[PDB]
UniProtKB/Swiss-Prot annotation:
Keyword 4Fe-4S set for record: no
Annotated transmembrane regions: none
Name of the gene encoding the protein in the UniProt record: ompR
Biological processes per GO annotation: phosphorelay signal transduction system; positive regulation of DNA-templated transcription; regulation of DNA-templated transcription
Keywords from the named record: Activator, Cytoplasm, DNA-binding, Phosphoprotein, Repressor, Stress response, Transcription, Transcription regulation, Two-component regulatory system
Protein's organism: Escherichia coli (strain K12)
Phenotype for residue 88 to C: Loss of transcription activation, loss of DNA-binding, about 10% phosphorylation in vitro
Assembly and oligomerization: Monomer in solution. Up to 8 OmpR molecules bind to the ompF promoter; each 20 base pair (bp) region of the promoter binds 2 molecules of OmpR, which may only interact upon DNA-binding. Binds to direct repeats in the 20 bp DNA fragments. At pH 7.1 protein is monomeric, as the pH decreases to 6.5 and 6.1 about 70% is dimeric, which is poorly phosphorylated. DNA-binding ability increases at acidic pH.
Cited function: Member of the two-component regulatory system EnvZ/OmpR involved in osmoregulation (particularly of genes ompF and ompC) as well as other genes. Plays a central role in both acid and osmotic stress responses. Binds AT-rich DNA. Binds to the promoter of both ompC and ompF; at low osmolarity it activates ompF transcription, while at high osmolarity it represses ompF and activates ompC transcription. Involved in acid stress response; this requires EnvZ but not OmpR phosphorylation. Phosphorylated by EnvZ; this stimulates OmpR's DNA-binding ability. Is also dephosphorylated by EnvZ.
Post-translational modification remark: Phosphorylated by EnvZ. Phosphorylation stimulates the DNA-binding ability of OmpR. Dephosphorylated by EnvZ in the presence of ATP.
Disruption phenotype: Loss of expression of OmpC and OmpF under low and high osmolarity. Deletion of both ompR and envZ leads to loss of both OmpC and OmpF expression under 0% and 15% sucrose. Cells no longer reduce their internal pH in response to external acid stress.
Domain notes: Composed of an N-terminal response regulatory domain joined by a flexible linker to the C-terminal DNA-binding domain; the relative conformation of the 2 domains alters upon phosphorylation.
Coverage span on the entire protein: 137 to 235 of 239
The protein's name in its UniProt record: DNA-binding dual transcriptional regulator OmpR
Key word Cytoplasm present: yes
Length: 99
């Protein structure tokens, strides 16, 4: 489904790879990351992410959205402090920026 940086994510099977090595995604990590990458370049509020994260499983209520973002950044970013793929939009929320 989706490639960015050294990552490949399969939205249907929940398979993720870093440099082709299999890397797991908890339910809530997966829920947040899928909401982000499925809306490329649309900044998403915490409320809208929480909402989009809801599936038929323990997903949205696993951890706070900001803690999920922080964990996803530590997984995907060379520097979590200056993120490339999971960016902050001041006033607003978070955004996936492809490539």
């Amino acid at each position: 489904v989706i490639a960015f940086g050294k990552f490949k994510l399969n939205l249907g099977t929940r398979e993720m790879f870093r440099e082709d090595e299999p890397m797991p995604l908890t339910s809530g990590e997966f829920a947040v990351l899928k909401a982000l990458v499925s809306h490329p370049r649309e900044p998403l509020s915490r409320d809208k992410l929480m909402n989009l994260a809801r599936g038929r499983e323990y997903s949205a209520m696993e951890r706070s959205i900001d803690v999920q973002i922080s964990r996803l950044r530590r997984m995907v970013e060379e520097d979590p402090a200056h993120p490339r793929y999971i960016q902050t939009v001041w006033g607003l929320g978070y955004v996936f920026v492809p490539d």
